[PDB]
Ligand binder design. Structure first.
Ligand SMILES: Nc1ncnc2c1ncn2[C@@H]1O[C@H](COP(=O)(O)O)[C@@H](O)[C@H]1O
Lengths: 533, 538
């Protein structure tokens, strides 16, 4: 027996419709590539999103055709977010800082039919254009420009295209599991749905995760070009938050000036960009008066950075962790009631880890055989996740058997405590599990390659009858040199604990490579099965 | 082309499973009928709920059979919420303040197969038991009691039945649109009707309730729902608090003001929720004893219009923020919540306060509009009033055992409330259309008049109703309860209206009573007051 409630699909277009209906005049600020500042609002963004969705539809594209972007955080990237998905196409955010052959691989693999790009990337797109055989439309996110058209015949222009859209366009309806958007980690594509997008927004919009309010002025410096700017374009629409979109000017002085000029209350960024922001802030003496809180994810937030925001500015720092495969958010560091009964300096220390998971995601750690390990906060194992916005399989790789008993392995080794707080410790593929302590193979490689007589080297875990696993140095002699095993091993002395030094050295002509370039440490392990027995 | 994400149903059992995994030791305080207090936590509630779901499945119940309850807010009621819905049955909370004859109708219409009930209602259940012929199991929410077994032969006992449950029971997996729970709502006209929620609608409502500008239950909070778990599932809080791992104080049978003040001060409540009448006795007792209610941060006040003077007392005297909220049994309940917008910060302080007085604005997932008598759209200009319509992910489509009818108008549900809507989406209740007063050819808000009167320091509370008059059809009558030490005159009460409302709308007469009649959910029984005073002006 079914309930008797109204049932509507969870569609991304409903998010932008709500913001225009109940927060239409709420301000959005957009830093453009030409140095102007657009002052728009949820209502104009919605009408342009509808118009561009009609315009895209009139090009004859098929449902769920991919629409690529190479774009900063600005109003036109935000209109594309909702135009593409709302009209039934797939919004494919591309990282414009990748190498040219990486972009050619990604754009051709996703089969983008349209490529929107900001003017910063004109020369990059013009350079790779010849290799983009499946793109039917290149669209500069600005007005007609005679120089640009010279660089890319026959470029089209956003500000003309959008005028082809009907003013009365209606969003189509479809299954909420319809593919909505795409993001690549050879890089692998994660294909989101409307359902997963909206549930992730819901979760991220709860008070104890991030939680956007109508009273906030939110500045996402995390890029809309990768993992959905942590869901902020969607969460801010559900709540009618004001937004400051920083465009291409991300150096400390510009970001500080945004915060003080528009009164940013909530800022979202990664550690390296914040280091620049805090540097300019210390110099000019600003109090960052409106700032209340900051979300820092994508790389481990440094404890001293948290302390600076707290002690200098009275700003709470939310360390958050995630990945393209989790839409991205998996965990966020927000305290529990009992923590207030601890000494204050221990309360501070509790904020350093990657955080606790919200409803809709589940975490666990497993041993090398895949069996559960205790969540005691000290035992380490391979981190596994599942939930409403965790992927099931990678794009165009459905036949590939990714999940392990319904769980996605993240690649990290981690600890989990009884409350679910997660600490990233290492990467599963990098660990050599020797008896008394685990060894990082990349740390030993970095020592080995610095030797004047080695072209390159690899370090692999190999079996040992007494220690389980021990490191073996697979070295390639540098041109014209004959170093001995003895001296190469002696080069580690004083650079690492002596019990971590590889047990033996083997020489080879070259290392087994991937078309990707990197080493296939798998055949190394097979070929040197009995090196230490 | 579909996405390639994990696709799981949204389940009520996922809420308790998340609380148990990641908030297992977070404490829940439970005031019991036996006169003691239980200190428990989400982990225990969850393990008990698992065992009870197993025990109920072992009885042979079929999927979506109705499980009935007649119970206070306490740990066993919370365990039942998750035990029944998690196991795939319909959790049917029943209001024990209804007449015995109404309970017979409701329980037989819903065909409950199990009736859980608290000890307070043992005589009630025993008096009507022979008319509950489809209930197969009567379960005292307690341990074996011989006296009770005498009153109800074949009575069973919650603390024995739970021991029949398997320790390793796994919740069934099923479509998220499966029916989950059932609440009956009456008034006018005729027999009460059933609202049949789903797991999907419940989880979606929970997400929305947990955003910052609605309620937003936090792991730091100590939540006390005075609203009953049989009144639209205590406004969702048992689901929203599980999602967030909030601490809870569950008040049991004692809901008078002195009991509530003591709960807040003893267990450090930070967020409390109930209808206006519940807060009158709380504020009254608190003023007498001198407490500062130090731990209290916020309240959620809804179910009837919150008096503007109640908001200002919480703000001025305790530094407590009142969130005025509106909703319905048919809306799971939440419709609107009053939290500011960014542009309100720059207004003068007194106009900021005034904007907190209306019923609030809607979160994502629900939509509001007003229509005229012919059913066509009216402007959302904040002045034009009309019939309020709603729709969304947690709005009813049709009533239980009544899916035949064309209830909706153009896909919208008619609330029965008369309201204005402003361009920012703030809703203001004018009246229930069954209560609105028509005098001399123009409508009068009884809600507006009575909450003007409530503000006078010499009245503890008041209500306004329409009564016949030979010239004007209806005229407003003020029914007033004098404050504890006070003796206001009739004339000084009607003068308090001067310049707050048009002169022709001021009540013509004041009658005093020692208490207002209240219905089974703490709101004023204005129909009884209209019958009792039908002649006050003739
Ligand atoms: N904040 C409020 N102000 C005025 N009336 C309210 C408010 N909240 C709920 N109501 C009334 O309560 C009705 C729902 O009643 P019930 O289903 O019994 O809880 C609504 O349709 C309104 O008439």
């Amino acid at each position: 027996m079914l309930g008797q409630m109204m049932t509507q699909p969870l569609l991304i277009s409903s998010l932008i419709d709500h913001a225009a209906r109940y927060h239409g005049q709420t301000e959005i600020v957009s830093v453009e590539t030409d140095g102007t500042v657009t002052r728009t609002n949820w209502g104009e963004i919605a009408a342009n999103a509808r118009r561009m969705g009609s315009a895209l539809t009139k090009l004859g594209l098929q449902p769920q055709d991919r629409i690529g972007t190479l774009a900063w955080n600005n109003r036109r990237h935000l209109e594309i977010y909702y135009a593409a998905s709302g009209a039934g196409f797939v919004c494919h955010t591309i990282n414009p800082r990748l190498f040219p052959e990486q972009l050619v691989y990604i754009i051709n693999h996703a089969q983008d039919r349209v490529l929107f790009f900001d003017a910063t990337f004109l020369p990059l797109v013009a350079a790779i254009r010849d290799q983009l055989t499946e793109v039917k439309h290149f669209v500069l996110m600005g007005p007609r420009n005679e120089d640009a058209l010279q660089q890319i015949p026959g470029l089209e222009f956003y500000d003309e295209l959008i005028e082809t859209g009907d003013t009365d366009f209606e969003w189509p309806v479809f299954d909420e599991n319809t593919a909505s958007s795409l993001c690549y980690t050879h890089p692998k594509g994660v294909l989101y749905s409307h359902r997963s997008t909206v549930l992730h927004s819901f979760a991220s919009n709860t008070r104890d995760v991030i939680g956007y309010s109508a009273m906030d002025v939110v500045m996402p410096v995390v890029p809309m070009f990768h993992v959905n700017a942590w869901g902020s374009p969607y969460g801010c629409a559900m709540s009618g938050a004001q937004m400051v979109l920083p465009g291409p000017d991300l150096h400390g002085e510009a970001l500080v000036n945004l915060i003080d000029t528009y009164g940013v209350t909530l800022a979202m960024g990664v550690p390296t960009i914040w280091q620049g922001l805090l540097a300019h802030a210390a110099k000019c003496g600003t109090k960052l008066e409106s700032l209340e809180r900051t979300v820092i994810g994508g790389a481990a937030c440094p404890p001293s950075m948290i302390a600076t925001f707290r002690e200098k500015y009275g700003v709470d720092t939310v360390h958050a962790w995630g990945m393209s495969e989790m839409s991205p958010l998996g965990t966020a560091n927000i305290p529990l009631a009992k923590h207030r009964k601890l000494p204050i300096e221990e309360q501070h220390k509790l904020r350093e880890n990657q955080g606790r998971p919200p409803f809709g995601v589940e975490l666990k750690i497993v041993d090398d055989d895949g069996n559960d390990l205790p969540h005691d906060g000290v035992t380490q194992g391979d981190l596994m996740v599942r939930g409403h916005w965790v992927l099931d399989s990678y794009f165009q790789l459905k036949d590939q058997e990714l999940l392990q008993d319904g769980w996605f392995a993240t690649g990290d080794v981690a600890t989990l405590d009884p409350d679910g707080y997660m600490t990233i410790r290492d990467r599963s593929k990098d660990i050599i599990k020797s008896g008394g302590e685990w060894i990082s193979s990349v740390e030993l490689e970095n020592i080995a390659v610095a030797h004047p007589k080695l072209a390159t080297a690899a370090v692999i875990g190999v079996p040992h009858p007494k220690w389980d696993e021990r490191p073996l140095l697979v070295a390639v002699k540098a041109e014209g040199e004959d170093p001995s095993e003895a001296e190469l091993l002696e080069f580690f002395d004083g650079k690492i604990a002596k019990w971590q030094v590889p047990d033996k050295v083997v020489f080879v002509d070259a290392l087994p490579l991937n078309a990707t370039g990197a080493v296939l440490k798998r055949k190394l392990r097979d070929e040197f099965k009995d090196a230490l027995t």
